[model samples]
Target: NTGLLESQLSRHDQMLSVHDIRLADMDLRFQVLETASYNGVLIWKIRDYKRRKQEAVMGKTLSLYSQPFYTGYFGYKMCARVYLNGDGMGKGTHLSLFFVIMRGEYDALLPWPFKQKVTLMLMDQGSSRRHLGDAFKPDPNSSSFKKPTGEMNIASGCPVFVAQTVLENGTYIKDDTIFIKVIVDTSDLPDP
Candidate 1:
């Protein structure tokens, strides 16, 4: 009888653990959406940059994704991905960064073929008054800029965002952390 009671308790414990996991997942989803930007800009601070960069270079992890952000309160959802050791033609030489358009709740009501200009910047931690920046106008003809039919559209941005050598002990990286900013042109875009 004692053995049977122990077995029953174990099963109940397992079920409770499952519920905990589910609750945590839901909480994270809520937080991500709750803190989302409505002004079409995302300033992401990547912590533990040194360790993550090493991991990427060693192939322990290939890339990292920024938290989801929005172009407006009811506008397009977006995110950013970074490859520390670079990718494609930039492999082993530079850091690569890309932008993604994610399927959102209000996507159906928004305009298709996103036409806003995107600007990316690697912030300088020091007061050098020098920051690395780039801007790209989305091509309406490319599938990457099209309205997402899936979870997200293919990432599009600079493959050689910055040279690895330039970031070594540079003002852009300090205290093992780095900041990246993305801005979308919402001036001429239709209001969501």
Candidate 2:
């Protein structure tokens, strides 16, 4: 009988051995809208990218992290934004935004074949606790809701990054900054 020898590797050390991966070349973008009220919707300019031969696509929802101490609700939504640039504003050529709810954090080290630019828009629901009210509100002083920075990359696939709300002053609401990043994945998968 023949037997094979096996070697043990530490979790921490194994992680160090893993490196970044590359992804396919494609056009993709994301728009994340954070709201205190669940009835609001986020909108984006579809004709911006759709006219460029890009198709509107939606991805699966992935759950990330949650904290019971912060406003009770803690999670992220992952979805794809489809659009076409240069095309006139029409139902089929206009920009469209989709929504997917994810639970916690995703840490899969995969590679993506393109770069993604993300835009965040703060909706205003005036006097009803549903709108952002004023567009002049600075992001720092805004409520506990915050946007994550430097989380997306080409090699990390589409990991759902996390962000926490921060207070800069006394205001509970403010406009958020546009956080942008790229994603890459070069993992072995079945041929398309």
Best by lDDT: 1
State in Å the error of residue 110, model 2. 29
lDDT of 2: 0.24
Per-model tally of clashing residue pairs: 0, 40
Looking at model 1, residue 148 earns an lDDT score of 89
Query: What does candidate 2's lDDT look like per residue over 122-159, in tens digits?
Result: 23223443322111111234321133323421111122
- The ten-residue window of minimal lDDT in model 1 covers 28-37
Tell me the spans in candidate 1 whose CA falls farther than 4 Å from its real position: none
Please report how far candidate 2 places residue 124 from its true position, in Å.
15
> Across residues 10-108, which tens digit of lDDT does each residue of candidate 1 receive?
999989899899987998788676757778888877888778888998988987777788877788888888888899988798898888888988888
lDDT of 1 at 191: 80
Q: Over all chains combined, what TM-score does candidate 2 have?
A: 0.20
| lDDT of the candidates, in the order given | 0.83, 0.24
